[PDB]
């Protein structure tokens, strides 16, 4: 028997023993057999896995660490094109997955059928592994060879919702880390704080200040704290201040004032909130609006000041 062929045969015995040590989690045996010549060896049969594939799939955390520390190729492929990250994700091995990612595993690696690690985690309902993957930039919209995404494979509505939410979330965080302004804007394009009623162009803030219910003040404050446009105009060019003022909802007028409501904003009739308060006879509303710096001399498009539209008591308040 040729000396080279004897050497190869001995090495094949040895590599099978290395693979066995990797699968079983046998640290001492692994470190006795592991050399620069077999660290990235492949099994002869079955999936043709490397030691790292086997340690990853069988949740041998210490073995994964030793292999990575002594030269193992985190990008090595089995016969189907799986990388070790695929094995760790399919079987839901969280610690292993995190170690592989720390050592540079490609989060969206594709096998020969374009399955990613997230396809594997999602299809087997590995919820925490899915969240870990998304936090390293996994993309749940990438399609495999059957036209199917990780979202399509997620077996529950809860997981599907979570993949979509966390993908969008991590997309925003990463765009913020890169100060990618166009990507931040795109990711925020469907926020609902300033959603508009399609017919009236009213927002939640217009609706809250019009409310008859007890906590309108608190709701309005909240909407404003969470990004409501204080001066948003409906179809008739009415701001929330116009809406509050014409109903004498004085508590919410205070909130709007505090958040920079524009006192002299003009509706489509050239009227201020003060015109509307005056026209409706809301006496305290008028005093309040004047104290906020509403201008009583503004002439509407019909040619009227607030005083020319109001009752005797309004006319007196406005002549002060």
């Amino acid at each position: 028997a040729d000396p080279s062929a004897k050497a190869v045969l001995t090495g094949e015995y040895k590599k099978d023993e290395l693979l066995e040590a990797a699968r079983s989690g046998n640290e001492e045996k692994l470190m006795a057999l592991l050399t620069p010549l077999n660290v990235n060896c492949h099994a002869s049969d079955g999936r043709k896995s490397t030691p790292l594939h086997l340690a990853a799939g069988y949740n041998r955390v210490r073995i994964v660490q030793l292999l990575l520390q002594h030269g193992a190729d985190v990008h090595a492929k089995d016969k189907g094109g799986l990388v070790p990250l695929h094995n760790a994700c399919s079987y839901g091995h969280y610690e292993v997955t995190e170690l592989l990612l720390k050592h540079g595993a490609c989060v969206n690696a594709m096998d020969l059928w374009q399955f990613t690690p997230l396809h594997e985690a999602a299809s087997k309902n590995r919820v925490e592994v899915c969240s870990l993957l998304l936090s390293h930039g996994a993309d749940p919209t990438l399609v495999n060879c059957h036209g199917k995404s990780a979202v399509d494979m997620a077996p529950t509505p809860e997981l599907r919702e979570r993949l979509t939410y966390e993908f969008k979330g991590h997309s925003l965080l990463q765009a913020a880390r890169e100060a990618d302004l166009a990507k931040v804007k795109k990711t925020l394009a469907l926020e609902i704080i300033n959603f508009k009623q399609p017919q009236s162009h009213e927002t939640a803030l217009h609706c809250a200040v019009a409310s008859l219910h007890p906590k309108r003040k608190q709701v309005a404050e909240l909407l404003l704290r969470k990004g409501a446009n204080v001066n948003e105009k409906n179809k008739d060019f009415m701001t929330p201040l116009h809406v509050a003022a014409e109903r004498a909802h004085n508590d919410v007028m205070e909130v709007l004032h505090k958040h920079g409501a524009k006192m002299n904003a003009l509706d489509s009739l050239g009227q201020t909130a003060l015109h509307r308060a005056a026209l409706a006879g809301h006496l305290q509303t008028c005093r309040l609006l004047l104290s906020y710096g509403s201008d009583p001399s503004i002439i509407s498009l019909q040619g009227f000041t607030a005083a020319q539209m109001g009752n005797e008591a309004v006319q007196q308040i406005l002549s002060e």
Binding site: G57, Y58, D78, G80, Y91
Partner: peptide, 10 residues
């Protein structure tokens, strides 16, 4: 024909 089962275990 893809084999569904990577090497490993739950």
């Amino acid at each position: 024909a893809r084999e569904s089962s990577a090497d490993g275990a739950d």
